[PDB]
Structure formats: C-alpha cells, structure tokens
C-alpha cells in the first residue's frame with residue numbers, strides 16, 4: 001500500500017499517467033464486453049445472425 | 055583558523071540551476087509518458103493510428119485488426 | 130503600473146503651476162496658417178530621410194526586377210531566359 | 215458617489231470609455247484601435263445581414279450572392295460594404311501593428327496585450343480566408359484547395375487531416391457549409407480576444423509616442439479621445455465611401471465572378487492582397503513543409519519581439535538607427551506583398567528569397583544588434 | 598538589457614584608445630540626431646521605468662531631483678502633444694545632460710544580481 | 722495510514738479514469754460528424770470509353 005502509493009499516486013505526473021493508461025484499457029475492454037453482451041441479449045435478431053442465409 | 059567561507063557560484067539562468075533541474079528530469083519523463091498515452095488515446099479511433107501503431111503491438115494488437123465482411127459493405 | 134485618479138502612481142509633484150483658458154475663451158484655430166505651413170514643413174523636413182531612403186531603395190529594386198522580367202520574356206531575351214531556367 | 219462609479223456594470227463601461235486615464239499626448243496613430251472596433255462592428259452588422267440572404271449549399275451559394283447583388287434592397291451596398299471593409303480591416307490592423315512595433319508597445323509591461331494581439335491577427339486571417347471561400351467563385355474554390363492543403367505538409371496524419379477538414383476528397387459542398395458556420399463564429403471569438411487584449415492593457419494603460427510614463431499627466435478618455443476618434447471615423451468613412459460607391463471592385467479579383475469549376479484551374483491563383491506577404495514567404499522555401507513552417511513562423515516570430523529588442527528605451531522616437539531599420543523592414547514587407555502576386559519567374563524567384571531572409575533577420579539579428587549598439591551610444595553620447 | 602550591461606560595455610570601449618577614438622564621436626552625433634534634448638529631456642529621463650528595479654531606483658532619488666524629473670516629463674509631454682520643440686532655456690544643453698539616475702539603478706541592480714548569485718551558492 | 726489515503730485516491734482516480742474515457746468517447750463520436758458523410762463515400766466509380774480518344 002505504501003509501495004503502491006509511492007509508485008502510482010504520490011507524484012501527480014505518475015497518477016495522471018496511471019489514470020490515462022487505465023482509461024485506455026477500460027475503453028478497449030468495455031467496448032468488447034458490451035459488444036458481446038449486446039449480441040447475446042439480441043441473439044438471432046441481428047443481421048450478423050441471419051447473414052449466413054444469403 | 056579559517057579566513058574565508060568556502061563556496062562557489064553554480065551556473066544559473068532564469069533562476070534555474072543544474073542541481074535543481076536534474077531533480078525534475080524524471081518528472082518531465084513521466085509527464086511525457088502521460089502526454090504520449092493521452093495523445094495516442096485521443097487518436098485511437100483514427101484508422102491510420104490503428105493501421106500504423108496499435109495493430110503492431112504484440113498480442114494486444116489483434117484488437118485493432120477488424121474487417122467488415124464484403125457482403126455487409128455498400129462501399 | 131497604473132493606478133487611478135487620485136493615486137495614479139506619479140512620483141510626488143510639487144512646484145508646478147499649470148494654467149489654461151476655457152474653450153469658449155480661446156480661438157480654436159489661432160495660428161493655424163502658420164502651423165499648417167511652417168510647423169508642417171519643419172516636422173516633415175526632419176523626418177524626410179527616414180521615408181525617402183527605404184522607399185527609394187525598394188522602388189529601385191522593384192523597377193530593376195520588373196524591367197528584367199519583362200525583357201526576359203521578349204524575343205530579344207530568349208537566350209538569357211533559357212539560361213535563367 | 216456618482217452612479218457611473220457606484221454601479222458595477224456602469225463602472226466597467228466608465229473605466230474603459232469615460233474616466234479611463236489616457237496619456238495626454240497620443241498622436242493619430244493611436245486612432246487605429248477605434249477604427250478596428252468600427253470595422254468589427256460594420257462586419258458584424260453587414261455579415262449578419264448577408265447571412266439572412268445567403269445560402270451555404272454549393273448548388274446555390276454563388277447564385278445567392280448574385281441574388282443579394284440584384285434583388286435584395288440595398289443588397290449591393292451590404293455586399294460591397296462587407297467585402298471592402300474586410301480590406302480596410304487589414305489596412306487598419308497593419309497600421310495598428312506598425313504603430314505597436316515602432317513605439318515599442320510590445321515591451322514590458324505590455325507583453326500580454328501584445329501576445330494576445332498576435333492571436334487576434336491569426337484569427338482575423340482565418341476569419342477572412344473562410345469568408346472569401348463562401349462566394350464559391352473560381353478564386354474561392356482554388357483558394358480553399360491550396361490553403362487547406364498546407365495541412366498535408368504535417369507528417370503522417372497530414373493527409374487524413376485534410377480530408378477531415380474537407381468532409382470528403384476535395385473542396386466541395388461539405389467544405390462550403392462548414393466554412394459558413396465557422397465564418398459566422400470566428401468574428402465572435404475575435405471580439406472576445408479583442409476585449410481580452412484591452413483588459414490586459416488596462417493594467418499598464420496606453421503607451422505614448424515619447425515612450426515615457428504618462429502617470430504624471432493623464433487626460434480622461436472622454437471627451438478628448440472621443441472627439442479625436444471622430445475625425446478618423448469620418449476620414450475612414452470617406453475612404454469607405456469612395457470604394458463602396460465609386461469603385462466597389464477595385465480591391466477584388468474578376469475571377470471570383472466566375473462560378474467555381476473543379477476541373478479548370480484559373481490562370482493565376484493569388485490570395486487576397488492582405489495575405490500576399492505570407493504567400494511570398496511560403497514560395498521562397500522550395501520544400502513543402504519548410505514553406506509552411508516559414509509562413510507560420512513569419513507571424514509567430516512577432517511573439518519574440520519582447521526578447522530580441524534589447525533597448526533600455528521604449529520605442530523609436532529618439533533612435534535614428536532603429537528608425538532607419540524600421541523603414542527598411544516595412545518597405546520589405548510591402549515588397550514581399552508585391553512579390554506574392556507576380557508570376558513565379560526570374561528574377562522574382564531569388565528576389566523573394568532575399569526579401570524573406572531580410573524579413574526574418576530583422577527579428578533575429580538586426581534588431582538585437584542595433585538595439586545593443588544604440589544603448590551604448592546613448593550612454594557614451596550623453597557622458 | 599540591464600543598465601549594468603550597458604555601463605560595463607561602455608567602460609570597455611572607453612578604456613581602449615582605438616575604440617574610443619572611433620566610437621565616442623559617433624555616439625555624440627547619434628545623440629545630436631536623436632533629438633531628445635530638443636524636448637528638454639535628459640538622457641536618463643528616457644529609460645524604461647516600469648520594472649521593480651527601476652521603481653526602486655526612482656524612489657531613492659533625492660526629492661529635488663525627483664521633482665525636477667516630474668517637471669521635465671510634464672513639459673516634454675506638453676511639447677509632444679502640441680507638436681512643438683523646446684526653445685531657449687528649455688533645450689537641454691550638453692552640460693545639463695547629467696546621469697542623475699545611473700548611480701541609483703546601478704546600486705539597485707548590484708544587489709539584485711548579487712542576490713541571484715548567492716541564491717546559487719554551493720558550499721565547497 | 723497509506724492504505725487510508727490510497728483508498729480515497731482510488732475513488733478520485735476511478736472518477737478521473739471514467740471522465741477521461743467518457744471525454745474521449747464523446748470527443749471521438751462527436752467530431753466524427755466532420756468526416757465524410759455516407760453519401761460522399763457512395764461516390765466511387767466511373768467508366769470511360771477509349772475508342773473515341775485519339776493518339777497523342
């Protein structure tokens with residue numbers, strides 16, 4: 001906790017760098033997660049689900 | 055016995071000297087990283103960024119290699 | 130570096146008496162003819178070189194350049210144009 | 215206490231236009247500030263009026279400008295007023311910048327109003343450039359094309375940015391509609407920065423032609439400068455009248471009365487006269503990116519005047535050598551202007567390069583040297 | 598540029614016989630063409646004063662010198678706005694063009710520059 | 722304790738992180754309006770004859 005504070009939080013330059021890197025990771029993973037979830041709740045309804053017939 | 059105090063003047067300019075600035079060099083580094091991550095994040099959507107930078111990153115880079123099927127593309 | 134009326138930031142003033150007269154008491158155009166002729170001549174004479182020298186130099190440069198350019202695109206200037214390109 | 219001082223709103227007006235303490239010796243070159251405010255007001259009035267009659271769609275734009283000329287009551291006047299005032303705006307802004315450079319208005323403690331001023335100048339250029347495109351004549355289209363391709367010089371992303379600014383693969387309808395929206399907006403941004411540079415100036419007050427403090431001898435802005443400003447307002451309106459009513463097309467290009475044609479490129483594409491010196495500087499550098507950098511640097515270099523001027527004295531009134539150098543600098547800036555509209559031919563190619571070097575060497579070499587030497591001459595000369 | 602700089606460089610020139618032989622006559626003509634004396638100014642009246650250092654130097658002027666400077670500034674401002682020149686006794690004669698302020702600013706700057714040096718001292 | 726402060730910086734940091742990700746999404750989606758609209762992208766093909774075109 002001391003270690004974590006000292007590395008990522010104490011210097012604002014480090015804190016802002018950590019926040020932005022986290023935002024980048026969140027953005028990419030959240031995109032993928034929502035995509036999969038949306039496809040499951042709307043299964044068989046989307047073009048991607050019927051495309052194979054054509 | 056000591057006749058005079060022992061000191062020199064370090065080079066300085068606009069009130070900065072090398073001992074001080076050298077302590078801040080790492081901080082500029084991290085700010086540079088923050089600006090780099092931030093900038094890259096801002097242009098992540100730009101197709102050239104994906105094509106030239108992001109898709110080349112090992113393992114992770116396949117996140118940005120996505121093709122529209124030719125059947126689904128009017129253009 | 131500037132204050133306001135009453136505390137403008139002037140060093141202390143002392144020993145100066147100022148006098149003037151009303152706009153209605155004065156002739157606004159008093160000495161206008163003398164000013165228009167003699168004052169303007171003096172002021173112009175004293176500044177003339179600072180205008181004349183740069184204007185005349187750059188006009189000469191332009192004149193030479195434009196005359197050469199005109200000449201290069203005549204029949205007579207064919208050969209000199211060919212070298213220039 | 216008087217209401218004009220007591221009430222906070224009235225007091226802000228009072229502090230700028232009435233009780234504002236001014237030097238008692240401002241000469242007529244201090245009148246360009248109010249002329250610039252006048253141009254801005256005329257442009258807002260005429261511009262908003264033209265917007266009520268103009269159509270930004272590429273299929274109708276050129277025709278909507280003809281409709282303004284031919285059908286709208288006094289539309290010809292409003293159009294010519296708008297077009298000519300854009301030129302007068304640049305005459306006044308060059309005069310104002312000339313005044314500032316000659317009298318050392320950029321020196322401490324006025325670095326901030328000067329630096330904001332440099333941004334105002336960039337905003338005026340962008341405003342005027344976008345407005346010119348709106349006519350969608352031949353000069354409009356090609357002007358946009360060439361200038362919006364200076365962004366292609368930016369490495370890597372440059373071409374992508376160009377297509378982003380066009381909203382397609384060439385200057386077309388998307389570009390015209392976006393330039394309309396931004397042309398409408400930019401003058402408001404410009405007015406805000408104009409207000410900011412005045413607020414920044416109010417901490418030191420106006421400089422004056424002698425370059426000394428005026429704290430010893432102040433005059434109210436009203437009535438003295440109010441009535442002195444009227445003289446130049448009427449002199450301006452006389453010049454305005456002669457162009458607008460008697461020669462409305464003298465400052466323009468006939469090719470802008472031809473509708474935009476993406477196929478045919480006009481014989482000679484030059485910018486509006488007031489951009490010509492920057493275009494000459496760009497031509498001087500053979501490299502694309504080089505040329506763009508130089509052209510932008512030619513404006514941004516104004517920001518270093520506070521540093522490179524080493525004088526212990528503000529302004530040129532008492533500096534004979536600085537006055538000569540200033541004269542050469544100004545005339546060179548006019549020669550660059552002229553060279554911006556000649557053909558790319560001998561011997562104007564090399565001349566443009568020499569004039570470009572002189573332009574930059576003023577800031578980087580001559581002014582620092584001359585100002586150093588004059589310092590020494592004042593001291594030794596008065597011993 | 599600092600007054601200190603200007604003064605030091607001037608002293609290097611005045612030392613060199615060759616240099617002074619060629620610079621001093623030029624400086625005297627420069628001053629004649631400058632024409633500040635024709636508005637009744639002394640050279641030192643023209644120095645930029647909107648700086649902490651110069652405000653401090655002006656506060657240290659003797660009251661009489663200070664009152665006279667105020668008058669010369671007001672008088673010159675009146676000549677300026679009228680587009681007239683000084684005549685007669687209002688013209689600054691070369692013998693009246695005394696460096697009344699230079700000593701004060703050199704002292705203010707001496708301290709300011711020593712302070713900057715000593716702010717950067719390193720115990721050896 | 723460091724643990725005590727670290728917790729509150731985790732909350733502040735998370736908030737900064739979602740605000741950063743949300744701003745990036747907002748900016749990217751919003752500015753994309755300025756990229757070529759669907760109709761512009763539809764223009765893409767032209768056939769030209771060659772029989773009519775003389776040599777030189």
Ligand code: HEM
Pocket residue numbers: 243244245246247248250251254307310311314319320324327328330331332334335404408411412415419420421422
């Ligand atoms: C819309 C354009 C502008 C307007 C309306 C405007 C207006 C004014 C006004 C009213 C003043 C005070 C009176 C005067 O000295 O003339 C002034 C002063 C000043 N302006 Fe501007 N200005 C504009 C553009 C610029 C630009 C482009 C610059 C600089 C590059 C600039 C720099 C200054 C400076 C330094 C002063 C203080 C000069 C002094 O009194 O010594 N302005 N401006």
Ligand code: HEM
Pocket residue numbers: 254257258260261262264265268279293296297300303338341342343345346347348349397398401402404
């Ligand atoms: C600093 C202020 C302004 C400047 C320098 C400026 C400059 C210009 C220029 C150079 C043109 C091309 C004129 C032509 O040759 O026909 C133009 C056109 C136009 N401007 Fe502005 N403008 C300004 C403010 C405004 C404002 C506030 C509006 C409000 C909408 C506006 C609306 C227009 C319109 C509709 C046109 C196209 C019609 C036409 O060409 O006359 N302008 N402007």
Ligand SMILES: CCCCCCCCCCCCO[C@@H]1O[C@H](CO)[C@@H](O[C@H]2O[C@H](CO)[C@@H](O)[C@H](O)[C@H]2O)[C@H](O)[C@H]1O
Pocket residue numbers: 096097099100101748749750752753
């Ligand atoms: C002021 C900062 C300046 C720098 C910022 C640059 C922004 C300019 C435009 C950003 C680039 C847009 O680039 C593009 O964005 C859209 C919008 O999310 C993305 O589009 C993606 O999400 C959208 C919804 O959000 C879906 O409809 C689409 O199926 C999906 O592909 C693309 O994957 C990306 O290629």
Ligand SMILES: CCCCCCCCCCCCO[C@@H]1O[C@H](CO)[C@@H](O[C@H]2O[C@H](CO)[C@@H](O)[C@H](O)[C@H]2O)[C@H](O)[C@H]1O
Pocket residue numbers: 132133219222225226227228229230231233413416
């Ligand atoms: C130019 C068009 C006229 C509209 C006014 C322009 C709008 C900008 C005004 C807002 C900016 C704040 O403006 C600020 O106001 C206060 C009071 O009003 C001024 O304050 C000044 O005048 C008042 C009395 O007149 C004194 O108390 C004060 O000592 C003095 O500094 C500031 O010098 C000015 O910088």
Ligand SMILES: CCCCCCCCCCC1=C(C)C(=O)C(OC)=C(OC)C1=O
Pocket residue numbers: 339343356357358360361364483484485486489492493496509510511513
């Ligand atoms: C810092 C620079 C501010 C923006 C300046 C843009 C306006 C002048 C640009 C020059 C120009 C270029 C480069 C140019 O190449 C061109 O020639 C065809 C012109 O006519 C359209 C131009 O106007």
